[PDB]
Amino acid sequence: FACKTANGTAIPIGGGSANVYVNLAPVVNVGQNLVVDLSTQIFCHNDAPETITDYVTLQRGSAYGGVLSNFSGTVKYSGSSYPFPTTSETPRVVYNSRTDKPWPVALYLTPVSSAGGVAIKAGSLIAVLILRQTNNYNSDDFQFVWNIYANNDVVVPT
Amino acid sequence: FACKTANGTAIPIGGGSANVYVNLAPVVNVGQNLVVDLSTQIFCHNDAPETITDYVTLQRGSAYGGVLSNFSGTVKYSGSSYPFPTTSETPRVVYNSRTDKPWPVALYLTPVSSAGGVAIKAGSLIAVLILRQTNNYNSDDFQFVWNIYANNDVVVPT
Ligand SMILES: CCCCCCCO[C@H]1O[C@H](CO)[C@@H](O)[C@H](O)[C@@H]1O
Ligand SMILES: CCCCCCCO[C@H]1O[C@H](CO)[C@@H](O)[C@H](O)[C@@H]1O
Numbered sequence: 001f002a003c004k005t006a007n008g009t010a011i012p013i014g015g016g017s018a019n020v021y022v023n024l025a026p027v028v029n030v031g032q033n034l035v036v037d038l039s040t041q042i043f044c045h046n047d048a049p050e051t052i053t054d055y056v057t058l059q060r061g062s063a064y065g066g067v068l069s070n071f072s073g074t075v076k077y078s079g080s081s082y083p084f085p086t087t088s089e090t091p092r093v094v095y096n097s098r099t100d101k102p103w104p105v106a107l108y109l110t111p112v113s114s115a116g117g118v119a120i121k122a123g124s125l126i127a128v129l130i131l132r133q134t135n136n137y138n139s140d141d142f143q144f145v146w147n148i149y150a151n152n153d154v155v156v157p158t
Numbered sequence: 159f160a161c162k163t164a165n166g167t168a169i170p171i172g173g174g175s176a177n178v179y180v181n182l183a184p185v186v187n188v189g190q191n192l193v194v195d196l197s198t199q200i201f202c203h204n205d206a207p208e209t210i211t212d213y214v215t216l217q218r219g220s221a222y223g224g225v226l227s228n229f230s231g232t233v234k235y236s237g238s239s240y241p242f243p244t245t246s247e248t249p250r251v252v253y254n255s256r257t258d259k260p261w262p263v264a265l266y267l268t269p270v271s272s273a274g275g276v277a278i279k280a281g282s283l284i285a286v287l288i289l290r291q292t293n294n295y296n297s298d299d300f301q302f303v304w305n306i307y308a309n310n311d312v313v314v315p316t
Contacts, residue, residue: 068241068245069241069245069246070241071241072230072231072232072241072242073230074230074270074271076271080271080272081270081271081272082270082272083226083227083228083229083230083270084230087226087227088227112232112239112240112241113232113234113238113239114238114239114240
């Protein structure tokens with residue numbers, strides 16, 4: 001089991017970490033949704049599909065920088081929404097094909113009234129999502145740490 | 159500086175802890191706000207206003223039980239909104255009168271789509287707000303710990 005990103009890098013069998021730079025809407029008002037869709041940027045595949053099945057959860061999702069202080073929100077995972085930053089590990093998604101399937105994660109962030117100005121700075125870490133992978137075959141328990149960075153400035157018009 | 163509640167328990171000079179039971183809207187839809195307004199339930203006053211002016215912030219806000227798991231939200235403090243659970247201490251509100259003035263705190267909670275049924279249980283701890291009071295006179299820095307419980311069940315229609 002391993003994952004890669006859209007045009008970026010990969011994290012191999014065993015787990016590890018990778019950076020993900022995401023394009024964010026450059027202007028968002030108070031009460032509107034910032035949507036960070038990672039199902040268009042993170043993809044994994046099962047490496048022994050005929051004998052092993054891989055179970056994949058979002059173990060922990062964390063907010064940083066401007067997203068931590070100026071936003072409140074949720075994370076949608078395989079069609080279900082949970083509070084973001086996360087307070088518990090999500091239910092598992094099954095990966096059983098050598099073809100790359102998306103990691104079904106999306107953050108839904110809305111700015112707070114006290115936000116004003118550069119709510120998120122470009123190039124800055126905005127979230128870190130952790131993909132935990134297990135299986136039906138052995139003791140293996142692996143974390144793929146995704147560090148999410150902003151490609152652009154986000155502004156909240158005051 | 160001291161505080162009381164509406165049918166009132168009190169936290170005396172020096173700080174301490176108290177319980178607050180709050181009436182909640184029994185039904186809240188996804189996309190709607192559950193509003194917990196403590197400005198109608200928590201009141202404070204200055205004990206030597208002719209010489210001392212007291213500074214009061216919301217130091218920390220923590221979410222519990224069903225609020226922790228099925229809601230995302232913000233906390234409003236003196237006309238500005240911040241993420242709830244909190245990530246930082248708020249700006250200070252000034253107390254300079256022996257008259258009881260409300261603590262200007264309100265929670266604004268919205269249920270997550272994966273929620274359904276009794277999202278908050280009656281009698282359960284749903285938040286803990288910490289009032290920090292200081293002043294311009296001496297070293298005093300006192301904490302008033304507010305434990306917020308639901309008076310009734312809150313249901314999210316699935
Ligand atoms: C049947 C012989 C072993 C065959 C799978 C070898 C590779 O194991 C890696 O790939 C596996 C299959 O995707 C994962 O389930 C496992 O946790 C790890 O990521
Ligand atoms: C003629 C000067 C009288 C001075 C009385 C000071 C009394 O201190 C109490 O009341 C002060 C004013 O509310 C508080 O700042 C302090 O923390 C404590 O609650």
